[PDB]
């Protein structure tokens, strides 16, 4: 009973020290787990959502909401641990262009989620506000037959959840472009809206 939605309390500074209850180190210890356990939890996720949903579209939106609830957490944790706690630090750039948060994703997010850095990151020549984020080998979903793409939305559900909470609202879809020796390649394309673009249209 400290902060309700009803009032504000007034208590004096430089009073007595209160009790010590719960604390934890924010910086990561290096922890590893098998790929099989997270793959088993991932297929159990897709199995339960296959069980309790009717058609493909709202299944995809529910999986994207599942990814969203990791991404909105993950933004502040990765930026705070890339700024460096009780140790003396400061504050990163807190980047605000479009072309460097995607650089931040392709550099740090994919090398945080996985051992390897993300592969390629190109724009679209035919239209602006379309950005291609591509890998060669999806390590979330390498265990499903390749003709289904909807099970690939969870990771781009992260990316929308990484982007909308960072101040750039957008929308993502994913397709599979079988280019080269990689049969599954998994393009994720990011559709922004107009209302952000003219904002950076206003900023020269």
């Amino acid at each position: 009973t400290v902060g309700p939605k009803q009032a504000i309390t007034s208590e004096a500074s430089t009073t007595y020290i209160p009790s010590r209850i719960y604390s934890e180190s924010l910086l990561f210890k290096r922890q590893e787990a098998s790929l099989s356990a997270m793959a088993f939890l991932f297929q159990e996720m897709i199995s339960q959502l296959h069980r309790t949903c009717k058609t493909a579209g709202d299944f995809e939106t529910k999986l994207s909401d599942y990814g969203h609830n990791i991404g909105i957490r993950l933004l502040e944790l990765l930026n705070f641990r890339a700024s460096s706690s009780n140790y003396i630090t400061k504050m990163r750039r807190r980047d605000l262009k479009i072309l460097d948060i995607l650089q931040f994703i392709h550099g740090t997010l994919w090398s945080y989620l996985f051992n390897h850095v993300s592969d390629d990151l190109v724009k679209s020549s035919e239209r602006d506000n379309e950005y291609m984020i591509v890998d060669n080998f999806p390590t979330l979903t390498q265990f499903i037959p390749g003709e289904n793409v909807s099970c690939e939305y969870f990771v781009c559900g992260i990316i929308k959840g990484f982007l909308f909470n960072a101040g750039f609202p957008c929308g993502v879809t994913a397709h599979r472009m079988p280019q080269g020796g990689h049969s599954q390649r998994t393009v994720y394309l990011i559709q922004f809206d107009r209302q952000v673009l003219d904002r950076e249209g206003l900023r020269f």
Partner: protein
């Protein structure tokens, strides 16, 4: 005395506390009930103006005193997720805040650390008030040690 707040993106507060020096056992005479929520919502406009610009009036997470208004120095801070850490400075006379940027910037840094510790709970979703007494105990010890 200082009024401290953390405000959401859809203009709602998740944390609010007011802490005073013990000489004035009652703090902020008559401003506390009416003036201090309204001038904070007024300062949210200009913090929303300066969040998207590049070169201020470096590093964009901290920023100085954003306005001065009825002799009150209003100091802001912008987190990575868009949360805004506006905290005002009152006194009977005028107040100097820029000399405490050696200390108050660090105060905003570990209360940002405390907010990241709050956010990592999977049960705690955003647009929820931070209804935890442990958070109060840490932020008033940080208010004591960063006076």
């Amino acid at each position: 005395p200082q009024y401290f707040a953390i405000i959401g993106k859809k203009d709602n507060p998740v944390y609010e506390i007011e802490f005073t020096n013990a000489e004035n056992p009652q703090g902020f005479p008559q401003d506390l009930k009416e003036l201090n929520p309204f001038i904070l919502h007024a300062s949210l406009d200009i913090v929303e103006d300066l969040q998207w610009q590049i070169n201020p009036t470096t590093d964009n997470c901290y920023l100085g005193k954003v306005d001065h208004f009825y002799g009150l120095a209003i100091t802001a801070y912008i987190s990575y997720s868009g949360m805004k850490f506006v905290m005002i400075h009152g006194n009977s006379a005028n107040s100097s805040v820029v000399i405490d940027d050696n200390n108050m910037r660090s105060f905003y840094q570990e209360v940002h650390e405390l907010y990241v510790k709050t956010l990592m709970n999977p049960f705690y979703k955003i647009t929820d008030p931070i209804r935890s007494p442990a958070f109060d105990s840490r932020v008033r010890t940080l208010a004591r040690k960063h006076l």
